[PDB]
């Protein structure tokens, strides 16, 4: 059954928010860098 205009508009809003948050979390999580650990045991 072909989706109504309303229904299409709402899925797109849903999928947009899901994409933003999926992207911002990806960007944020990796930004807890293993570069910030203590590496000084290495000398």
């Amino acid at each position: 059954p072909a989706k109504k205009s309303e229904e299409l508009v709402a899925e797109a809003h849903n999928l947009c928010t899901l994409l933003e948050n999926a992207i911002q979390d990806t960007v944020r999580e990796q930004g807890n860098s293993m570069m910030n650990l203590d590496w000084s045991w290495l000398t």
Partner: protein, 61 residues
């Protein structure tokens, strides 16, 4: 005629939206899986690099 014109632009905007929605649902799913791989690689490397630290500590003695 203003009706045929509108209906035709209604279908094209409805085709642009279904297609873009398909892509966003594929891209989000891909991105959710990458996030899980990233988290596992990191747990892996934090483990190795903690074992390496303890093996260094352990040798100095």
């Amino acid at each position: 005629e203003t009706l045929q014109r509108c209906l035709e632009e209604n279908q094209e905007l409805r085709d642009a939206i279904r297609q873009s929605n398909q892509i966003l649902r594929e891209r989000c799913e891909e991105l959710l899986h990458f996030q899980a791989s990233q988290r596992e690689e990191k747990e892996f490397l934090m483990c190795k690099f903690q074992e390496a630290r303890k093996l260094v500590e352990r040798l100095g003695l």
